[PDB]
Amino acid sequence: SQLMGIITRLQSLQETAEAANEPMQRYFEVNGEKICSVKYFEKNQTFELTVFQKGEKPNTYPFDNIDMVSIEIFELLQLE
Amino acid sequence: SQLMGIITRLQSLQETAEAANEPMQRYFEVNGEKICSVKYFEKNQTFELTVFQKGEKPNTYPFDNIDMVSIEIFELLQL
């Protein structure tokens, strides 16, 4: 399912960030368009979600739980 | 599992490719030795696998499916 796929990607995202010992990020797009990007800071075990809006400065939201950031991303992609 | 790791690396290979509208590449190894290499073509939707053979030109093989190539890579590493 889509949700399964988002969680996997976020797990490998943190996994890759811990090894590189530096923040890492990726985008989630729907139909070729960037809807949001997530950055993992191993300065804890938190995710920072950035939500794009045309002509507007993007908004960021912190999350310390992978399941909760995944849900937010999912609902965000659902509204397309 | 080892296979899952190959899949997710390729998933991001493909995805970061469509983050700047340009191809992307990656190596897969066993004990520091490069076994094969992969490149993805966004404006194409294909994965190109390059397999290495000492003292010879490498063979490239196209794939339009991430699962197909992930499998091909896994079996190459298993050897």
UniProtKB/Swiss-Prot annotation, chain B:
Originating gene: ykuJ
Species for this entry: Bacillus subtilis (strain 168)
Keywords linked to the UniProt accession: Signal
One Pfam family of this chain: DUF1797
Signal peptide start and end residues: 1-19
Protein name per the record: Uncharacterized protein YkuJ
